[PDB]
Amino acid sequence: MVLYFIGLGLYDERDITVKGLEIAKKCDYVFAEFYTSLMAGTTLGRIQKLIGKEIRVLSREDVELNFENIVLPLAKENDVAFLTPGDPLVATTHAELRIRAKRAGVESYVIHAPSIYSAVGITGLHIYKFGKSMTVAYPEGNWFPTSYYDVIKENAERGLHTLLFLDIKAEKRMYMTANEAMELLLKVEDMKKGGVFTDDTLVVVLARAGSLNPTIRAGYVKDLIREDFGDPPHILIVPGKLHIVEAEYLVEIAGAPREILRVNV
């Protein structure tokens, strides 16, 4: 009679909360999805071994079109868990799955876990200063989407930081790199000539957040566009003007150049 939405955290199998693990261990069935994101620092095998339950993986269609035919029926007469990378209900379409549960006469509870939305705090940027967030998407065929670029302009205009998720093909395991995102943005800039993202723009790159050894780097696009930030996933952040303390952190902790202490403050 209960469905548990349990987050797995940021990077590996230990990023799940003690509450999340203990509850999942007492469930009769355990589902998971890895289409909204992947746990780059672990495997399904390691996650199963830790929970001690076999985990049936679901596709985007399994969830989006048949959550009520696949997961909810079992939740009617058992304790069922639905695992997802990060914090549950962060992924735009997930909240409504709770409405489905309600409609099916199933109770649902949410066990939270670390999300990249809060993990970026490790970049030293004050979290209250973040504005609208967006995802950078790959152009394709006759379609060049550029709204993420307009958002950077609108946020920075107001002194707000912009968090940019990079496109991902979880099935193909093809991640967009911070480098590809920057070059995409330089291309969009050349098209709109808006002066929003150039070689002189200051950006922050966060890779493998959650890991004990994440890669935190800050600098101008002209020097970072070709730097190796390691293995995915990659998160890109275009900061609005900086508070002196944020700059000091980026310089001391993320190796940013002294120049931002006068140029971007």
Ligand X SMILES: Nc1ncnc2c1ncn2[C@@H]1O[C@H](CSCC[C@H](N)C(=O)O)[C@@H](O)[C@H]1O
Instruction: Catalog residues that contact a second copy under the rule CB under 8 A.
Output: 7, 9-10, 12-19, 21-22, 50, 86-96, 98-99, 102-103, 109-115, 117-119, 121-122, 124, 126-135, 154, 158, 160, 165, 209-210, 212-213, 245-246, 248-249, 252-253
Category of 232 on φ-ψ map: left (φ > 0), alpha (ψ -120 to 50) or beta: beta
With CB under 5 to 8 Å by kind, the binding choice for 235 among ligand X, a second copy, none is: ligand X
Please report which helix (H) or strand (E) contains residue 61, including its range: helix 60-70
207 binds, among a second copy, ligand X, none (CB under 5 to 8 A by kind): ligand X
Segments of 34-100 assigned E as strands: 56-58, 79-84
131 binds, among ligand X, a second copy, none (CB under 5 to 8 A by kind): a second copy
CA dihedral 207, 114, 170, 154 (to 10 degrees): -70
With binding defined as CB under 6 A, does residue 124 bind ligand X?
no
Check: CB of residue 81 under 8 Å from CB of residue 27.
yes
90 among annotated binding-site residues: yes
Within positions 185 to 224, which residues make up the interface with ligand X, using CB under 6 A? 206-210
The residues, any chain, with a CB within 8 Å of residue 88's CB and separated by 6 or more, are 5, 6, 7, 82, 94, 110, 111, 112, 113
Q: Which residue is nearest to ligand X (CB)?
A: 86
Q: Which residues bind ligand X (CB under 6 A)?
A: 10-11, 36-37, 85-87, 90-92, 115-117, 165-166, 168, 206-210, 233-235
